[PDB]
Each structure stands twice: as structure tokens, then as C-alpha cells.
Amino acid sequence: MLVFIDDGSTNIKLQWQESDGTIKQHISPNSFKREWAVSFGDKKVFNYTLNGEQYSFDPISPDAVVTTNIAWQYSDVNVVAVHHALLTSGLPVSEVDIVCTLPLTEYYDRNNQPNTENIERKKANFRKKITLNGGDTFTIKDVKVMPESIPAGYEVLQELDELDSLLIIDLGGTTLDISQVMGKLSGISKIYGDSSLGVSLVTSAVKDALSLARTKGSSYLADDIIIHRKDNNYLKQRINDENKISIVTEAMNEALRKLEQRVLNTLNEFSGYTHVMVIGGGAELICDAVKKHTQIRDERFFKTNNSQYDLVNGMYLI
Amino acid sequence: MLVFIDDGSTNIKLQWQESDGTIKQHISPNSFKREWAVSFGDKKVFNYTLNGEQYSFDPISPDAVVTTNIAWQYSDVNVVAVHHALLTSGLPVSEVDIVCTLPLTEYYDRNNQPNTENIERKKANFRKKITLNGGDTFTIKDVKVMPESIPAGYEVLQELDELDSLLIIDLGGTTLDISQVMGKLSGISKIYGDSSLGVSLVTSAVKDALSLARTKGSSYLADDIIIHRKDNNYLKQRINDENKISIVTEAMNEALRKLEQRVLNTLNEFSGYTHVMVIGGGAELICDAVKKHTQIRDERFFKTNNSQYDLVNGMYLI
Amino acid sequence: MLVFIDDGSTNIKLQWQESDGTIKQHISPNSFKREWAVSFGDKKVFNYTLNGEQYSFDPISPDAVVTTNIAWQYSDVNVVAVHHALLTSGLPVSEVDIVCTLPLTEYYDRNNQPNTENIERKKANFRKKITLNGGDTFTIKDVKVMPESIPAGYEVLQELDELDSLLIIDLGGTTLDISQVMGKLSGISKIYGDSSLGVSLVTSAVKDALSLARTKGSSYLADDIIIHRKDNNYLKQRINDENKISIVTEAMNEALRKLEQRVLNTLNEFSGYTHVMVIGGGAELICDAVKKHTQIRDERFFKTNNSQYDLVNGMYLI
Amino acid sequence: MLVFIDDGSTNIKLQWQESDGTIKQHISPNSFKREWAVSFGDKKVFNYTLNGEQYSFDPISPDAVVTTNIAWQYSDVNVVAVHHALLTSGLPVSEVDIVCTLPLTEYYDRNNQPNTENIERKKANFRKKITLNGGDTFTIKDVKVMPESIPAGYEVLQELDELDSLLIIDLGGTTLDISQVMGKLSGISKIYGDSSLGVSLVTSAVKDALSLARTKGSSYLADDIIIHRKDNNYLKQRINDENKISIVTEAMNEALRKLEQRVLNTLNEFSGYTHVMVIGGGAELICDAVKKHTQIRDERFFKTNNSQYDLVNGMYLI
Amino acid sequence: MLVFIDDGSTNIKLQWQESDGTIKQHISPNSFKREWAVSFGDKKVFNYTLNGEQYSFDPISPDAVVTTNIAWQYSDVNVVAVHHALLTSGLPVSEVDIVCTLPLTEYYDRNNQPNTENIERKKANFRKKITLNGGDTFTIKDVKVMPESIPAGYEVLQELDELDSLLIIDLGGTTLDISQVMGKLSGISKIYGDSSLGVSLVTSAVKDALSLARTKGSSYLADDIIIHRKDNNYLKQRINDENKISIVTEAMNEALRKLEQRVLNTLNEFSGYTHVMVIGGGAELICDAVKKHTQIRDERFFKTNNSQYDLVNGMYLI
Ligand SMILES: Nc1ncnc2c1ncn2[C@@H]1O[C@H](COP(=O)(O)OP(=O)(O)NP(=O)(O)O)[C@@H](O)[C@H]1O
Ligand SMILES: Nc1ncnc2c1ncn2[C@@H]1O[C@H](COP(=O)(O)OP(=O)(O)NP(=O)(O)O)[C@@H](O)[C@H]1O
Ligand SMILES: Nc1ncnc2c1ncn2[C@@H]1O[C@H](COP(=O)(O)OP(=O)(O)NP(=O)(O)O)[C@@H](O)[C@H]1O
Ligand SMILES: Nc1ncnc2c1ncn2[C@@H]1O[C@H](COP(=O)(O)OP(=O)(O)NP(=O)(O)O)[C@@H](O)[C@H]1O
Ligand SMILES: Nc1ncnc2c1ncn2[C@@H]1O[C@H](COP(=O)(O)OP(=O)(O)NP(=O)(O)O)[C@@H](O)[C@H]1O
């Protein structure tokens, strides 16, 4: 099979069609500790070994390595993460072939051409050899790359025309990727990638707030707080023992407001967009401010019900 | 081949006869950005390099260089534009020979003789060396020039007589060129060229109106508005998000009315014309006001169905 | 060669015998604009330079200089006109010698002798130096003058007798020249020259009528109207766009009738004429009124088929 | 007030008597660009709006509209020009009444009577509505016309007699107006107007010479060169950067010599003048050649110290 | 005090006269990171808080925000920058009143009048409330604006005359501002502002070159390279560890040559300038090419010894 992995910093997204026309979407959060897991026998398992150090999954605790740093797309951790995600697919273990991502800024340069060097460093990373203990790993044979902007506009761009342009706003954990594509993928006017502007901004405050609230925890738990920002009762079941939900919520809310400003300022680098779309899990978080700031009328704004998956789906339906 | 390029400021017009008696008319809008295009592979392409800077096509966005300035007929951009136009001809890439234009005022002087200096500066411009990346460019060998007035009257002038005169009104993007030719090209009484009076007058207001309407765009898009001035529904599909079609249409209409006055005033420099013709894409825009102002009876007024092409056709059928 | 130029105000008439006994008659209308002609290469040409100003031919348009003023026989324009006429002869360019005209009043004075002063001013005018651009002009060496009356009667006067007299009426564009010659050129009784009575009278009304009819034009075009006064259809092909042929024809007809009166009044200054002849292009216009007013019987009235040329032929066949 | 405006093509001349017996002469050069002026606040101002287009003053640069064309006496520009001139008078803004000019040829026709049609078209032009921005314009109520020949001879004609005639030569920018008036305004023998023979002849060569000398400029600057033709040092302060003062001066001198010829030829249409006067700013330029050509003795030749103003003064002191 | 801040994109320039007739010039580079500075106590300090986010100075490292984007004249950063600059003046902290800049294109519009809207948005920006921690900030009371072209010509324009024109070329980091002012500030013929043509062109290539040379750095460091382009030894002390000075210098030199072309092309929009001046820090970089291209003689070309300060000085000495 050719199988699609959108390897994001925080979540691996898979698209893959079992020959029965069965196209499947499978997501896997990345949260890895640099040591093995301790067993009590009932499929408690998934300890991986690669180039000295070893790893195993941990969703909940600190010293799961933080992956918001830029160079995640050449990390050894990345290889671990992707293997682990595909090992929980429900696929027949085998050799297979894949397509993966690069961030917008990685492919390109001063004269807006493919950065073959960085593209190939990427391909080479998935050659690294890795062992899971009691069990065989899938083998990853052929690798190719796509950028992280275009394909999420795919369907919408089709029924657009030839003289108009769709602004695709991709906000991920690490990177804000913006592209303007004129009227189908007939043309791509302008791209922009800002690897310092991600959802990380608030997560990496709220981590510190949770530590103040005596809940020193994983990045994943912190994101779980951000996802359920609206229910104070839910947050009671996660913030360890306090009336100081109050310290955390306000610190979270302040830093949330301060994300918007810098993201919107970045948008005013582009103009002449006829249609505007917002994809990525972070779309949920900024959607209304964007829609309102760009004065687009309802029919020209498309924001989907599974924003998190738009990109890998697009990669597939090319 | 000898191939005919009417190189207008805004549109390159080509006439060229494949030896099978096949004479072809091909037009190409000029809209170029001073940087390369960004690829996704499916003949996405056409990045040109000449004397330091580089260029690529963009129909839609600002910072495509505005070519309404006078000196376009010695611009490096011009060379780019003409090469690009011929690269989309469907011709066998090769060495070839061409004829091109000069504006009426460029050929001539105080004692109404050829301005060999300006004629030769023109020829020399098409010697400039240029590279397109993955592909070979046609080579332009022998160059000659014709003026931008005479040849569009050619057929009509033939079946005129010898004692009467045809007024050819050429309105282009930059230049209003008027000539009076007595009874076939047996004689040419009077010429006149006004390089400050072009269609640009309205385009360069409506550009600013579109920016007010939050549609900061290419000259080409603005011309597309002017071409479809009559359908408010069409203009809904181009004016980005507004009841303020209203601001744009009136500003456009006012500036349109104010073109006519200055063009008609210019005509009252000539007299004794028996026959009147109007050529160029701009003919469409002023035709009725001229016809009515000059009190010519129907049989003496000739305005064609492809006004935009009259000149290059004339160049050819000499 | 000695070549004959009847230099009339409006038309240069040439007579010249190629040594093969080949006597040729060639006429050239004078209509000159004080600036050079504009080329498209196909023998488009004939720009002359003399004593500062320059000239070129224009048959059709105003600001061709009007030559009905008296002093035409010392004008610099005259030199231009005569050179131009001989340059279209089909002669081998060279040095040559010529005879030319003077009006009746110019040769003579109070005691009816040659006016050597005016005769010599005339000769000196054809010494003026003149350049045509790409080409050599004929050189005019020896010059002599004849008066504008006698020689047109030449053949008829021969077979007349010795006791009877022939009235020669020369009506030109500027001048009415009348002479009575008794019985061959054995004697010349009486001359009379009226330089204010020419065909100009009607031409210079009809010019203004044509301007009323929005056909502001050359003197030549106006004469072309006068020549084809009889065909309303012809005049439709020249009068620019009107039911107001009506304004022009009546104004022309009125002024035509008013010529006759003053010319006939002038004739009643002479008496005792046995034979009457009318020469010049204007003869056509007044012939019947004269014939009828002078009650001459048919056999004594001679009006030729090429009245325009009678004088230069006479100059030659002396 | 009844206020006198000699509206010449190039300069508006005003005469006007503040009720304190204060008669004032005020002149204003016409040089107008078809767009508004850009402010820095210190009475930087004078932007006028009339019938679509707008205007403001510019003395120095090209695309100030050239007003040497004939139809200036029905131009909308004319109205602008006259308003502007009167706005710099130092008059109390108000309703007022005026007398203005027409060229000699405009008043008259084939039967030498007032051309009421053209006289009234003139009157109607000054009804046009015009706005200056921050400020009120004078209102022009009652309008009458005078011809451009007679009144400049006024005083001199008074102390002439009744049997002799004064030739008034008016040379303006566009028009050569000549009149012969017998012995006071007791009679006017003959008029003549040549609207193609003005000072423009040299100005419109020297403009092109200045462009050759890389000094592409206003008509006004060119006239400023003509006015200071005698000081090479002055012309150093205006001709932008060159030893090629040499190219300009000779081209100017040649075209100057070639004016004289055609103007003198025009004079030989008149005769029997006892007294000769030369008025207009152009008088300065041709005075000596005329005086010498007409062999008038000193006491019969009157050429004034403010030739430019003779006409408007005459209009007033009728 | 009224104190003069020329707020340029890259450098704040101050002029201010301590009542002792003491006029002072003080410049401050803008380079700000969106987080606070870390102390070791010895006046290590200058952390500012405004509308959520905070800022502090950093000259040396990336993620100091790049201010070459257009909208810098309404940025919150701008307010920070200006406060910071004035906090290092050596002034008594207080309420004070200021004048500041706008770019040429910001003041004006289609009908060349003040753009009150943009002028007032500017004034309002300096109302924003800001806190520096341990210390009081100056309070900015009254604000007015001047354009970025005129005042740098001030002294020179005074001793010019009234019929000639001075071309002031302002090249800044973001904007090329050109103005032609006729003979003192008696008149201003033509302005032009190109906000896409700044020194940024080369800086924003050389930034990327430095990253190739493993010296990923601040804009300021990159400018420091450009300033000391001539000493290879100096550049050894800044380019981190390489024989590949070679990669950087050539990339810098190429992009430098390609600035000139586009700036000179822009100049050929103006003509008739008698005097030419070049101001701004960028003047140093293009001076010779301009001087040579415009063929001005030495005495008409003025380029000062503190080009960077010409504008704020002019603002003051109005
Ligand atoms: N439904 C959601 N509600 C709230 N927060 C969410 C939601 N989905 C995702 N997030 C958060 O947003 C973060 C970044 O968005 P996401 O699109 O998942 O990044 P990614 O694709 O994994 N990485 P990348 O695009 O490479 O930066 C996630 O890690 C979560 O913390
Ligand atoms: N069919 C049309 N309807 C309306 N506007 C048109 C049409 N065709 C052209 N135009 C407009 O008229 C402008 C100038 O006419 P055009 O003849 O196309 O110029 P050109 O020959 O390419 N250039 P030039 O003659 O050098 O100024 C175009 O750029 C369009 O904006
Ligand atoms: N065949 C003709 N029919 C009608 N009108 C004619 C004809 N030939 C000439 N004319 C008119 O008569 C005018 C004067 O007669 P023409 O004899 O041609 O003058 P000329 O000899 O050239 N000049 P001149 O004798 O010096 O006044 C011409 O200019 C024509 O307008
Ligand atoms: N004192 C002068 N010395 C030299 N040239 C002058 C002088 N005064 C005027 N001129 C030139 O002569 C031109 C025409 O003369 P002028 O009398 O000023 O015209 P006008 O009366 O304003 N116009 P008009 O009579 O309608 O053609 C001016 O535009 C100047 O170029
Ligand atoms: N002396 C110098 N030598 C070389 N480069 C310089 C010099 N001074 C300034 N520059 C460069 O030129 C750039 C822009 O010129 P500068 O006049 O400083 O801009 P500004 O006035 O601060 N901003 P703006 O006019 O709004 O674009 C600076 O940021 C430097 O990179």
C-alpha cells in the first residue's frame, strides 16, 4: 500500500484505503518517555529501541519529550512516533510505502523552488532502523513528501473558477502555514510559513500554570484542558485539588487572547483573497476572529467539521 | 518564419502563417511579477531570467509591474512579455524573424521623417539574452518595425479612391494615435500621437476604487471589470464582498465620461476626413461618441468585429 | 533643350519636343504645403528646401498656400512649383533652358513698351537655389519671357488677312487678359490686363461654401467641384455628408452669374474686332455669354478643344 | 463694474477702474494642468472644478495643456483661465460685467458683417459653472465682445485726419490680425486675420529643441527663453546642464528668421497705408523688419513701450 | 517641549532643542523581542507592557520582530519603539508634544489632498497606554504629522529661485519617496511613493545568506554587514566561522546591483528637475548611480554628510 501519514508535531494523522474501497482515518497523539514501560501481562507493551536510547509511550506524565521545537521533522522521536501510530492501525504488518508532510518553510527558499536537500533529509530519516521487542514492526519502503498547505483546499478549490483565490490558513501546534491559491490548483499566488507561531504559545503557558496548580503534567493533559476549556466541571476532574481553577483559567484566557493578535497581524501580509478556509485542530480556536476580521460573506467561508483531518484527506484525494 | 508581433503595452498580438496557408491570430495579456513562480508539478512553470532580476507570470495580484508608462517600448519587461507570448503560440521552438510596432510619436519628429535612432534602439532591445529554466526559448533573429496607425486601414483604403481621406483612430492602453490617409495609401496627410491619452485613464482610477472596495488587485482584473461593465451580476463575482459595488461603478462611470471629452477635443485637430475608422480594443468604448460627433453617414463609418486585432492583421497583409 | 513653361497661377503647363520630333504637353496643378511629407516607402517623396522654409505637395487639404494673389509671378513658391512640374515630366534630369510667361500688365506700362525691370526680376527668380532630398533637380540655365495674350491666336492669325482683327480673350485663375491683333501678328491694336478679374472670384466664394458644408478643403478640391458642376452624383462623392449640396450649388451658381457681368463690361472697352477667340481653362465657363454678347457669326468664332493649353502651344510654335 | 478682459491665448490682460479713477492693468499667463495641486499650508491653493475634469495652475512642467489651437476662444480651459486671472486681481469678489475679445476672423465672414452666431457662442461660454474649493469665485454677469484689431490704434487714430490710413499690425501667439483704418475710426478699409500665423511658430520649434537639450518643459518656460534670447548667461540658468546651449540657440534663430518671411508676405496683401503701428507682445520681435520693409518715415511709425497691453487699454478707453 | 520624531521603520530619529538653544540629534535602532529581558543588576532593564503582550530590546538575535512591512506606521511596536528611543534621550521625563512622520503615499490619494483618515489613525496610535516596570515613561500629549519628503530640501530650496525645481530622493528601509519642488517651497510639482522599494531588498536577501553562513541573526546585524561592506576584516569579526565570507559577499553584491536598476527606472517617471538631492541612510548606497544617470553638473547636486538625519532636521527647522 501507499499510505498517507500527515506527521504533525503533536498528532500523527493516517489516511489509508484497504483495497475494499475502505478509506480509514486514524489519529495518534505523540507522547513518549525515554525509557521502557513496566509490564503486568495483558498487552501492556510497546517499548521501542533505536540508535542507543529507548522509548515507550506515556500520555500522562512529565519527561515525555516536548516536541514543539522546529526540528521535530528530523527527530529520531519522529520515526518512533510514526511507527507507533501505524502499529495501532489494525493493519497487516508488512512492507508498505508512504507519503508524509513537510512544513511550508521547509520545502522552499528564496527562489520558491523545492528544497531538495531538506526534502531528502526527510526521506532518509525513515530509513532509520528500529526494534519493538516481542513483535515485528511494519517496514517502511518507499517515501515521498508533500507540503503542509495545499491539499486541504482540494475539493473546494475544484468548484471555484479560474480568476479567484482561496486563502488556506493552517494553524498547527508548531507552525502557522498560510497559502493563497488562485481558482483551483491552476495557480498558487503566495505562501508563508511562521514556525514560531503555533498553538504551542498557549499550551506552553498553561503547562506552567498547571505546575503552579500542583498538577505538573504531560503536554497532552494540558491540551486536554485546552480542548475542554468550556466546562468548569470537566476541569474539576483534571486540576488536582483546588479552588485555584481560578489561577489557571485566567492565565489560560489571557494567553489565548494574546495568540489572536499575532496570528491576525500575520494575515495582513496577504491580500486579494476571495475565499478563506481555516484547517487544523487549531482552526477551532481562532475561527471566529478570522472570519470577522476578513469581512468575508458567509458563502465564501468554509470551515469543516473535522478540521484536524483536512490535510491528510487532501493528501489522499490527490 | 517572419512572424508579426503587435507589441502593445497591455496585450501582445500575434499574426503568423503556418506554411499551410494557416494564418493564426493569438493574443497574450501582459502581467508579470518580479519573482519566480512556486511549483506543484503539472506544467506549472514559466520563470524567466534576464539581466539580474527574474520574472514570472501573474494575472491576479498587485506587484505585477504596471506597464502604462510610455517607455514600455524599451523596457526589459517588454522582451520578457514578447517571449512569453510566443512561447504559448503552439509553434515549433526555433530561430525566427519578426516585425513589431512603434507608437506614432516614436518613428517621427519635427520634420516628419523616420527617427532611425528610436527605431534602432527598438531593434536592439530584442537582442537581450533571456533564459527560461527547464526548456529552450525561441531565438529572435531579424527584427523590423512598423508604425502603429496605417496598416489597420489597409483593406478599406484599397477600395476608397484617390481624392478622399480615411481617418484611422487607434486608441490603445497608453496612446491615442490618429492618422488621416488620402485615398488608398497613395498619400498620408496628417498624423498625431498623444502618449498621455490612453484607456489607462479609467483603469488607473478604477484600480484605486477597487482598493477602496477592499479588492486590491492586478491591472488585468481591473480591465476585466471594465470589459464586463454592463453585468452587475458578473461584477458581483469579482468585487470582493460588498453592497459597495455602488462606490466602484459610479467612480468608474464618472471617469469614463471624462475620457470622452479629452479624446474628442483631440480629434478637432484634424479636418476634411471623408471616412472614419476606429481600431484597438478601446474602440468599443468610444465608438458611438465619435460616430455621432463627426456626423459621418453610415456607409462611411467602419468599425470591425475584432477591433483589438485590426493592426496586427494589417501588418501581416502588408 | 529650350522647353516651354506657361507658368499660370494654378497650373503649370509644359510644352517640349524630344528631339524625335516628339512635342509633349504636360500640365501640373500647384498645391503646396509649407512642410515636408511623411513617408511610407514606395516613391512617397518630393520634399523641397529653398531659402529657409520647406515645401511639399498636397492636393487635398487646407494650408496649401493660396496662389491667387497677383505677386505669384515673383513668389519663391513659383520656383518650387515649376521645378516640381518638370520633375514629373519623364525627362532626363539636366541643365536646360526655358521660356516662361508674364501677365499682360507686367510687361507694359504707360508708354506701351517692355517693362525690362519686371521682365528681369522674373528671370532672376529662377536663379534661386533649391534642393530636393534623395535626388537631383534639373538645373535651369537660360531664361526668357513672353507675354500672356498673343501666341494663342498664332495659327488662326496666320490665315486671317491684313485689314481685320482678332480679339483674344485669355481668362485665367487670377487675370483677365484681352488683346486685339490686326490681321496676322502684322499689328497689335490694343491690349488690356485686369489682374483682379480671374476665375478666383467663384473659387474663393465656393471655398467658403464648402467650409459651411463641413468640407474645409484645398483650392484644388474646390476647383474639382467647379469642373464637375453638372453632375450632382459626382458632387455627392466630394461634398462631405449632406443634403446641403443645396447650400453649395446655389452659392456657387449665384457667384458664377456674377462673374459674367463684370467680364462682359470689361470687353466693352474694345471695339472693331472681326474675329473673337477665347482661351484658357476659364474659356469653357464664359464662352456662350461672350459669343452671344458679341453677335459674331459662327465662322468668325474659334474656341478650341484644349483651351487650357492654347497659350503654351503658341509659345512653342513661335 | 464693467471690467475689461483681453483674453489672449497665452496671456489674460485686464483693465479695470476702481471707482477712485484708478485704472489698473493686470496680466496673467495661462498654464494649466488637468489635476489638482498638492498642498503645504501657506496659501498653496487654486484648484478649479468644471464639468467633470478639474484643473490647477502649473507654470513649469509639461502636460500643462497647450492653448495655441484656434478653438481656444470656445475652450472650457478659457473660462478657467479668465476666472483665475481675475481671482488674482486684488478685487472684491462679486458679480461683475465684462467685455472680452474675439479674433478678427471670428466676428466676420464673406459679407463683412458681425458673425452673431460666433459672437453668441462666445458669450455663452462664460455662463459655464465653475467651483474653486475653499473660497468663492467672482460671478460673471453681463458679457459683450469686441474685435481684436481696432481699439489699439485708438488714441493715434484720433489725431490723424480724415483722408489717411493707419495700418494696425496685431501679432499674437496664435493669430496675425491686420487692419487698415482710414483717418480716425471714421472708416475701416480692410481687415485680415491669419489664425495659423502666430508667435507659436517659433515657440513650437523651441519646445522640441529644449526636449533635445533634456529640458522637457512648459510652454511658459519656452517663452521665457524667447524673451531672454539676448543673454546667454540668463539662458545658462534655464537650459538644464549643457554646452548645448548651442543646439537650442541656432534652432531658435533659424525658426525666428523663418517667421519674418511669412509675416511680411502677408502684409503685401494691403496697400496705401500712411501710418503703421505694431501691437502685441510679438511686436517686439518683428518691429524692425516691418519698419524697414514699409519705408515709412520715422514720424509715421508708432510702436509703444507696453505693446502687450495696447489692445485692452483701447478696449477700455472706448 | 515640541520634539521632533522622524519615526522611520528601522531607526527613530530625534531632534529637540533644550531651551538653552541646544538642538540635539539622537538616533535609535529598532529591534524588539516579544518578551522581557533577564536581569543582572547594573541598569539591565527596559521591559515594556502594552495591550497584553510585552516587549524588550534585543539588538542581536532572531525573533526580534521584522519591521519592513508597510503597516509599521500603525503598529503597536511603533509606540514601543518611539517611547524607548525617547527614554534614552537624556531628557527630563514629562508630558511633551511631538511631531512625527507619514510616508508620502499615506498623506495623499487620487486628488492629492491630505488623507485625514490616515493622518488621524496615526495620531491615535500614540494614545495607546504603555508601562515600563521600575520607572515612569514620558507622557506624549499633543501629536501632529508631516510628510516624508519636503523638509529635507528646506535650506537648499531657500536659495534656489522661483522658476526651477529640486528633486528630493528619499530612500528609506521600506519606502522610496520622490518629490520635485519648484524653486523654494513656493510650489511642489509632483510626488511619488513606492512602499515596496526600500533598502529592505538587499537586507532581506543578506539575512538569508547569513543563515546559509550559519549566522542566523537580527536584522540589525545584517545591516551592520551592509554598512561595513568594504572591509573584509571587519566582516571576519561578524561572520561566524568561515572561508564562506565568499558565499555572503557575492549574494550581497548581486542583490545590491539589482536594487539600482529598479530605483533608477522609478526616477524616469519624473522630468525637468534642475537640482537633485538624495537623503536618507540609503542615499550613501545609490548616490553615484543617480548622479551619473541624471547628468547633473556638480554645482546642482547636493548630498550631505549626515544623510540619515536630513529629514528630522528639516522637520525641526520648519
Ligand atoms: N478539537 C480541538 N479543540 C481544541 N484544541 C485542539 C483541538 N484539536 C487540536 N487541538 C490543539 O491544537 C494543537 C495543534 O493542532 P494540530 O492541528 O493537531 O497540530 P498537528 O497537526 O498535530 N501539528 P502541526 O500542524 O505540524 O503544527 C493540538 O496538539 C491540540 O493541543
Ligand atoms: N473588448 C474590450 N472591451 C472593453 N475594454 C477593452 C476591450 N479590449 C480591450 N479593452 C481595454 O482597452 C485597453 C487598451 O486597449 P488595447 O488595444 O488592448 O491596448 P494594446 O494595443 O494592448 N496597448 P497600446 O496600443 O500600446 O496602448 C485594454 O488593456 C483593456 O483595458
Ligand atoms: N476644363 C475646365 N472646366 C472648368 N473649370 C476649369 C477647367 N480648366 C480650368 N478650370 C478652372 O479655371 C481656373 C483658372 O484657369 P487656368 O487657365 O487653368 O489658369 P492658369 O493659366 O493655370 N493661371 P493664370 O492664367 O495665371 O490665372 C482653374 O484653376 C480651374 O479652377
Ligand atoms: N516682451 C516680449 N518679448 C518677447 N516675446 C514676447 C514678449 N511678450 C510676449 N512675447 C511672446 O509672444 C507671444 C504671443 O504674444 P501675446 O501678445 O502675449 O499673445 P496673447 O495676446 O496673449 N494671445 P493671442 O493674441 O490670442 O495670440 C507670447 O506668448 C510670448 O511667447
Ligand atoms: N551609513 C549607512 N551606510 C550603509 N547603509 C546604511 C547607512 N545608514 C543606513 N543604512 C541602511 O539603510 C537602511 C534604511 O535607511 P534609513 O534611512 O535608516 O531608514 P529609516 O528612515 O529608519 N526608515 P524608513 O524611511 O521608514 O524606511 C537602514 O536600515 C540601513 O540598513
Side-chain angles (χ1 to χ4, degrees), chain E residues 236-294:
Chain E
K236 283 181 160 203
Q237 317 314 110
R238 309 292 9 268
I239 274 63
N240 228 52
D241 204 311
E242 253 320 306
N243 57 64
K244 298 163 58 263
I245 283 179
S246 323
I247 200 171
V248 150
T249 178
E250 161 273 348
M252 194 179 134
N253 258 317
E254 186 85 323
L256 275 170
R257 189 185 78 259
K258 283 143 63 236
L259 184 61
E260 293 279 27
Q261 171 89 246
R262 52 181 124 194
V263 62
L264 265 165
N265 208 70
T266 318
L267 212 286
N268 85 11
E269 199 200 74
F270 291 75
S271 186
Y273 39 88
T274 55
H275 298 91
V276 187
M277 93 168 305
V278 193
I279 73 125
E284 309 297 330
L285 201 274
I286 69 104
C287 161
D288 59 44
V290 153
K291 156 64 183 202
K292 133 272 148 180
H293 182 266
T294 59

Side-chain angles (χ1 to χ4, degrees), chain C residues 8-11 13 148 171-175 199 223 227 280-282 284 308:
Chain C
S9 57
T10 307
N11 299 97
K13 286 127 210 181
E148 187 174 307
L171 72 149
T174 63
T175 318
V199 171
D223 288 328
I227 287 161
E284 309 297 330
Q308 187 85 115

Side-chain angles (χ1 to χ4, degrees), chain C residues 39-316:
Chain C
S39 295
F40 214 56
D42 253 298
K43 254 272 129 171
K44 291 215 74 218
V45 74
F46 288 120
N47 297 250
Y48 303 72
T49 18
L50 167 138
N51 290 110
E53 206 110 293
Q54 14 91 76
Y55 299 99
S56 76
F57 193 55
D58 185 304
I60 169 270
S61 69
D63 215 70
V65 175
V66 240
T67 50
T68 49
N69 272 41
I70 306 92
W72 197 73
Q73 300 284 19
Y74 302 96
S75 83
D76 283 355
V77 154
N78 189 189
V79 170
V80 173
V82 303
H83 269 284
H84 176 273
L86 57 76
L87 259 131
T88 63
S89 53
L91 278 160
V93 187
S94 173
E95 81 86 51
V96 252
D97 328 301
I98 47 79
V99 141
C100 57
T101 227
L102 267 169
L104 253 175
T105 62
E106 276 287 11
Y107 245 90
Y108 300 132
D109 28 34
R110 282 256 59 78
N111 243 222
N112 301 24
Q113 290 313 317
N115 203 237
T116 49
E117 188 45 54
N118 277 242
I119 257 71
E120 263 287 10
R121 288 159 50 91
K122 172 68 185 188
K123 262 102 149 182
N125 232 121
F126 309 169
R127 262 124 258 191
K128 301 263 180 163
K129 240 290 184 186
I130 173 158
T131 323
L132 174 57
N133 289 314
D136 184 49
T137 65
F138 289 70
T139 274
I140 228 70
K141 214 289 184 196
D142 147 65
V143 183
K144 298 158 302 325
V145 202
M146 287 176 69
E148 187 174 307
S149 101
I150 293 157
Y154 204 73
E155 309 97 61
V156 195
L157 279 172
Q158 300 250 226
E159 184 213 329
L160 210 157
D161 77 319
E162 210 162 303
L163 233 188
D164 292 41
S165 61
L166 176 38
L167 199 70
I168 305 103
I169 301 170
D170 165 54
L171 72 149
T174 63
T175 318
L176 186 75
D177 294 306
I178 328 95
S179 59
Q180 188 196 5
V181 189
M182 53 159 164
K184 320 198 304 95
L185 206 56
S186 59
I188 175 154
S189 188
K190 251 226 294 181
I191 42 168
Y192 187 57
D194 207 31
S195 239
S196 324
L197 259 65
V199 171
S200 156
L201 186 273
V202 184
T203 278
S204 255
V206 75
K207 199 96 86 94
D208 222 72
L210 271 275
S211 280
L212 316 187
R214 315 189 73 91
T215 321
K216 190 190 304 97
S218 53
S219 337
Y220 176 37
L221 168 154
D223 288 328
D224 257 39
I225 303 324
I226 294 161
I227 287 161
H228 300 70
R229 185 46 268 166
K230 291 89 222 174
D231 191 42
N232 58 302
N233 249 236
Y234 164 90
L235 298 175
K236 283 181 160 203
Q237 316 313 111
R238 308 292 9 268
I239 274 63
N240 228 51
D241 202 310
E242 254 320 309
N243 57 64
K244 298 163 59 263
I245 282 179
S246 323
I247 200 171
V248 150
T249 178
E250 161 273 347
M252 194 179 134
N253 258 318
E254 186 85 321
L256 276 170
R257 189 185 78 259
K258 281 144 63 241
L259 185 62
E260 293 278 27
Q261 171 89 245
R262 52 183 124 193
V263 62
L264 265 164
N265 209 69
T266 318
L267 212 286
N268 85 11
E269 199 201 74
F270 291 74
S271 186
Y273 40 88
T274 55
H275 298 90
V276 187
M277 93 169 304
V278 194
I279 73 124
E284 309 297 330
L285 201 274
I286 69 103
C287 160
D288 59 44
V290 153
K291 156 64 183 202
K292 133 273 149 179
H293 181 266
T294 59
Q295 328 96 18
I296 259 60
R297 37 49 252 284
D298 290 314
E299 320 105 339
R300 265 41 132 71
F301 198 78
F302 330 87
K303 187 252 196 147
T304 65
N305 13 96
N306 48 35
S307 190
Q308 187 85 115
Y309 268 136
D310 282 23
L311 209 101
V312 73
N313 170 52
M315 287 163 72
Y316 162 60

Side-chain angles (χ1 to χ4, degrees), chain E residues 213-236:
Chain E
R214 315 188 73 90
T215 322
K216 188 189 305 97
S218 52
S219 336
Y220 176 36
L221 168 154
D223 287 328
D224 256 37
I225 303 325
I226 294 160
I227 287 161
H228 300 70
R229 185 46 269 166
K230 291 89 222 173
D231 191 42
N232 58 302
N233 249 236
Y234 164 90
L235 298 175
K236 283 181 160 203

Side-chain angles (χ1 to χ4, degrees), chain A residues 261-273:
Chain A
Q261 170 90 245
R262 52 182 124 193
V263 62
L264 265 165
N265 208 70
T266 318
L267 212 286
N268 85 11
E269 199 200 74
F270 291 75
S271 186
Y273 40 88

Side-chain angles (χ1 to χ4, degrees), chain A residues 108 111-113 146-147 150 163-164 180 182 185-189 271-274 295-297 300, chain B residues 33 36-40 44 47 54 58-61 214 216 220 224 234 236-242:
Chain A
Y108 300 131
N111 247 212
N112 299 22
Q113 290 313 316
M146 288 176 68
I150 293 156
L163 234 187
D164 293 43
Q180 188 196 5
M182 52 156 162
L185 206 55
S186 58
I188 175 155
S189 186
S271 186
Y273 40 88
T274 55
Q295 328 94 17
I296 260 61
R297 39 45 255 283
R300 265 41 131 71
Chain B
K33 56 167 212 160
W36 277 1
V38 74
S39 295
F40 214 56
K44 291 216 74 218
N47 297 249
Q54 15 91 76
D58 185 303
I60 169 269
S61 68
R214 315 189 74 91
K216 190 190 305 97
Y220 175 37
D224 256 39
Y234 164 90
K236 283 181 160 203
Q237 317 313 110
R238 308 292 9 268
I239 274 63
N240 228 50
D241 202 310
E242 254 320 309

